[PDB]
Structure 1
């Protein structure tokens, strides 16, 4: 049948320092540019788009990540790096050594993200060859979304400033985290926001009137656990739109268009290629999964 193997030639013998970090991460996922057996080291890193002196733009880096093929390491010999390949759709072992550690189980779902917490921890530099190698981060799909949710909010509220506890902290059950923003190029993260101004004001035009009248009946006295956003007071805008009388066949045409544009919001909140894990071992930290196509 099909083989999958990439062995990487390298022009200098690696030091014992940098080999100890590579021996630590023997099971890891890093993307690379071309589909061949032999390969130069300048394609193995994710740092062809994310270098130090270049200001990184994590949306464009994540935009970069869906293009490339993904690969898993097998051995780290002191001359040649040896990797295995991931093709849709193939079952394969994957092992998480990833440093901001989360816990998985059987029947979980994953995604691949650029490093958004600690670049210095998740990237090792190679002083022997002069080229650095950048590792992406694998995240379950709930936090896979919820970090991108915060980074889109952040570029909204850095432009208005032309403080940090509300904008830079990704929330999760049990833990809070710090996003890495010191030097970010907003221009590729703002074109996504440029399309968000397109979808969101169209959705403000076709608003169902009955579903506005539902909140005027709800949030004044009927208090629920998931309506604490409004804090018990109606917004001033919602009283203005509900002056019209209700009729069913107006909203039937509206709610289908409300339905059809939420089909489009998949395309702007996309992750990378997804990973549907069926079996995960706990104490071994190995797993098994099939790589999804883009």
Structure 2
């Protein structure tokens, strides 16, 4: 009974060159900041948050996508784009036009991720309005939890080689990170090491955890001694390394240790969810020659 359609108007007409690129992706998934049918251009991409003049971000995009409404292109007419609204648990169709091309299968779980690769792969610049629309990086969930991980390791050792040359080998680093194995297939990703500023915020966070966690878990074990101690915590004393358990906690005072334990957990829940929960959707049918996947959206 309900009507859903999202029709965006423009101020100026499109060029003849920019029309052929959106005709190439006439099926896609765009995030879109508003739920109403009539709307201006400045929301339907990722140019509302991520831009060239601003510093590139990962986390503020991932905060934004789970807060945002998704939509699917239907027909590109100058100058009025016609998106279709995505509902909770609604069945619809996706064509997979994304650079670089990852192969989809049916019975896989699509996870919308932000784009962290090159500009010409991700965005299509609209010269008529001077505004950049950005297509997100639709990648299956097991790749998206693995294409993130090796590039986040490659970002760390790129920070070590720039500080000291002798610790990291480039041949050892490239061959083990830029080649990603999934579903029996291999994908050599574009490195873009020509100058990965997207992943600097995560590489700051996981390291600040990695020092405070072994200092943190020593104090949290010794403070919980009871006769009602949970009996699985006696087992995990064999898991912690022996060098961890030799910390003199007389060195850090109480007005320092309250500041650490609050910094300890506040990074954890802000980092746990941004790996976990975004707009993530299922696929139950797929055909490679038509490049069309029947999907349904699970909002979480």
List runs of 5+ in structure 2 lacking aligned partners: 162-172
Q: CA deviation at 1:181?
A: 7.3
Cα distance change, pair 196–50 in 1 and its aligned pair in 2 (3 A): closer
Q: CA deviation at 1:240?
A: 11
Cα distance change, pair 262–46 in 1 and its aligned pair in 2 (3 A): closer
Q: Is the 8 A contact 1:12 1:129 kept in 2?
A: yes
Separation in 1, partners of 2:214, 2:276: 27
Q: CA deviation at 1:79?
A: 1.2
SS in 1 for 2:213: coil
Residues 1:174 and 2:184 are matched in the alignment? yes
Further displaced range: 96-105 or 230-239: 230-239
Q: CA deviation at 1:84?
A: 0.2
Further displaced range: 163-172 or 37-46: 163-172
Q: Is the 8 A contact 1:219 1:234 kept in 2?
A: no
Cα distance change, pair 139–217 in 1 and its aligned pair in 2 (3 A): farther
Further displaced range: 219-228 or 280-289: 219-228
Further displaced range: 150-159 or 120-129: 150-159
Q: Alpha-carbon deviations, 1:234-282, whole Å to 9, x = none?
A: 9997999999999999999999999999999963521421111122233
Separation in 1, partners of 2:157, 2:68: 31
Structure in which a larger fraction of residues adopt helix: 2
Q: CA deviation at 1:56?
A: 0.7
Separation in 2, partners of 1:249, 1:131: 49
Separation in 1, partners of 2:138, 2:37: 25
Separation in 2, partners of 1:68, 1:53: 23
Q: CA deviation at 1:31?
A: 0.5
Matches within 5 A, 1:195-214: none
Q: Is the 8 A contact 1:65 1:272 kept in 2?
A: yes
Please, what is the CA RMSD of the aligned residues?
8.4
List runs of 5+ in structure 1 lacking aligned partners: none
Further displaced range: 110-119 or 175-184: 175-184
Q: Is the 8 A contact 2:62 2:274 kept in 1?
A: no
Would you say how many aligned residue pairs link Structure 1 and Structure 2? 289
TM-score, L = length of structure 2 = 0.67
